[model samples]
Target: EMEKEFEQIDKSGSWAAIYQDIRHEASDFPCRVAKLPKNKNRNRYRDVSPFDHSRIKLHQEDNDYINASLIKMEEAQRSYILTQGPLPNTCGHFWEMVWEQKSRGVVMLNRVMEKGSLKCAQYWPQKEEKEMIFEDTNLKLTLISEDIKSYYTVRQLELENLTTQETREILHFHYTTWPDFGVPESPASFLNFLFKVRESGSLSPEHGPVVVHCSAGIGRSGTFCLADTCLLLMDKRKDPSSVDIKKVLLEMRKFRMGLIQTADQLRFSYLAVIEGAKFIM
Candidate 1:
């Protein structure tokens, strides 16, 4: 049945219609997202907003606003801490949030620098550099091992609780092929990247929700989460043929805005989902 739906979508090229419809439906959000555009340090070059109701409210201890949100999917038993790449300043907040939330991994969809422009702050230790410390939170992040891949890179990050001297290992899955604002060149490499994150046991319910981000924490980040969630439901229901791609994307947009940013991205998602269905089923 899903194969038929995939064929129908492919034959009719209906992704545009569905993409536009989803964009229109988001305008009526009951509450406004707290962009805090006034804040001097929030690093979103675009889509700097977070749903007022769903945005992660920080401890009254720090800046009240961070360009991040806690996206929950209770039914799927999964969650994602979605945020933009850290700014030069929010790098502290980034690690602090991870420590506070006990996140097991961080999935970065953008590189530190892209196309001769800075996409995110160099918030982690360098290849030879073993440790990077955040003063604001008194946390230290040490690079343990770096595995370079053709289209992605996986690093083992050891996050230490400076106060208690306790440390936990966090997986860093970076997808290097995603464009600044467009889809990946193809879905195969992207799926391979997704499976590597999955294989790490980072996205499981037992651990802290994996943190996912891109330049604006939407676009490629949304595609990653949406496809993963849809595939997860298909496997759980034992019915890869029955999950609704459009409906699932719409449901996720409720927790955050501008997920799956473009018509091209939405189409790529369908393609990725269709191809990914095979590996699971």
Candidate 2:
């Protein structure tokens, strides 16, 4: 059933229609909180904003507005905070969210600079700096170790609460090769990266939601979650053919609007899921 739809969607060229249908369904969600004047500057993109009902609220800050959403996939027992790349001013708030939520990992899908444009702010401490302190949040992040691969890099970071003198280790998974508004090189490479994160056990329910971000937080981020969730459902049921990819994506968009951005991305999701099924099956 899954392969047949993939082939049909490809042969009939219905990717556009299917993608548009998703957009139209999710378009009506109200972003009342993200539109306020106080939160306007916090948004990376003027048009892309988090839906009010499902938006993640910062516990420490009085003004808790962050362009991030808590995407919950209950059937798969997965919960992820999908968010935009941190802006210059929102970097502190980004770390604040990580600390407050007790998130064990952050999955970054875009580079810091892409196509001569700054995609995400440098939120973590680099090698030279060794440590970055967020005075406002009373938090300090230190780079402990880094493992660089061809398509991705994994770094071990120590996030410390200055006030309490406590620390937690965070795994940073950076997929450097993925292009903005485009899919990864192939399903194999992308799956390899996904499973690496999976192996870390960060995406499990044991920890806080794994925070995922790209430039806009909708396109590539959505693709990653959709593929990951579908593959997970397949694994749990031990039936690859039973997973409904489109239905799964629609359920995710209920928490965050405009997930799985483009027709090409939607196509790549099917391809990745089809390829990933081989492992679980």
TM-score of each model, in listed order: 0.91, 0.95
Q: Model 2's lDDT to the true fold? A: 0.86
> Which regions of candidate 2 fall more than 4 Å away from where they truly are?
none
Give the clashing residue pairs of candidate 2, or none: none
Expressed as tens digits, the lDDT of each residue in 122-234 for candidate 1 is: 88886647688887778899999999989999999898878899998899998887776567767999999989999999998778889888875347888899999988888
Task: Superpose all Cα atoms of candidate 1 onto the true structure and report the RMSD in Å to 1 decimal.
Answer: 2.2
Residue 72's lDDT in candidate 1: 86
lDDT for each residue of candidate 2 in 121-147, tens digit (9 for 90 to 100): 899887836689889778999999999
Q: Tell me the TM-score of model 1.
A: 0.91
User: Each prediction's Cα RMSD?
Assistant: 2.2, 1.6
